[PDB]
Amino acid sequence: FNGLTGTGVLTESNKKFLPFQQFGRDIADTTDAVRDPQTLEILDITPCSFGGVSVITPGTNTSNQVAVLYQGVNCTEVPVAIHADQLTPTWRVYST
């Protein structure tokens, strides 16, 4: 937006922006929200879902089988981050 580049999810926000204010910032000094140059609508930017990945496995001597942990993420997103839709059916089994 106007050269401000980033990645995130644009959602309608309920911030009370003043008519003069172009956009807002978080404590981080990172863009919290923007208003469209085309439409005077307020959008909050929440960075797209991500989190750590950890593998829970028994000893390799014991077995190959594993279980994966997606840190602090709702189960819904696992197909989303991965772009499971694109992948082959072999991959898809893991998605959900």
Binding site: D26, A28, T46, F50, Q71, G72, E77, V80
Partner: protein, 48 residues
Amino acid sequence: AGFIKQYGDCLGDIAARDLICAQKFNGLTVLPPLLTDEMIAQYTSALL
């Protein structure tokens, strides 16, 4: 605190989409404690 408090607000939002807070914004996440607060009470109750 500014950031930490901001993080808590993050947990509050149901409406927001694609809101994985662990990310705060720049890779800084908070792992939960293994022994949950409820559990901690049981130890103390037992200890009691």
